[PDB]
Amino acid sequence: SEYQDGKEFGIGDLVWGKIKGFSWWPAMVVSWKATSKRQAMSGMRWVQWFGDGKFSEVSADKLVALGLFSQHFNLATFNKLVSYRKAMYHALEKARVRAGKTFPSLEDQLKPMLEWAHGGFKPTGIEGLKPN
Numbered sequence: 007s008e009y010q011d012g013k014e015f016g017i018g019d020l021v022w023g024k025i026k027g028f029s030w031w032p033a034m035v036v037s038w039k040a041t042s043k044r045q046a047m048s049g050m051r052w053v054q055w056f057g058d059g060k061f062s063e064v065s066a067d068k069l070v071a072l073g074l075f076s077q078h079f080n081l082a083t084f085n086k087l088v089s090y091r092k093a094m095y096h097a098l099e100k101a102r103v104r105a106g107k108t109f110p111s112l113e114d115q116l117k118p119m120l121e122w123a124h125g126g127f128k129p130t131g132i133e134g135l136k137p138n
């Protein structure tokens with residue numbers, strides 16, 4: 007089936023993706039059928055970026071699990087780009103619902119999800135970010 011090339015990451019997975027020119031950006035691994043384009047080349051994954059909803063063919067080597075958060079979260083880009091803050095929100099919101107986490111503005115709503123993420127996604131850890 008699709009994405010069976012002996013590489014990491016399958017459909018539904020929350021990831022950081024690295025496009026030349028940009029900070030690591032949050033994405034979801036999607037099937038090529040959702041993209042309205044074509045099958046990915048071997049060793050690549052279609053992702054849909056949080057915040058803008060666009061599609062990219064990205065190598066599996068330029069993707070890491072979103073759960074490795076503090077390692078790829080980019081504090082500078084977060085302070086500089088409103089689009090990145092926007093992206094964080096939609097990314098973390100999706101993570102929250104998956105992990106069965108709940109929290110009590112925008113920057114104000116982001117704050118505890120950001121802390122949860124940076125803190126290691128407690129109590130479930132990264133296990134709680136899986137699809138299904």
Ligand SMILES: CC(C)(N)CNCCO
Binds near residue numbers: 028031057060089
């Ligand atoms: C998602 C990209 C293409 N890596 C950057 N998008 C910036 C505007 O949201």
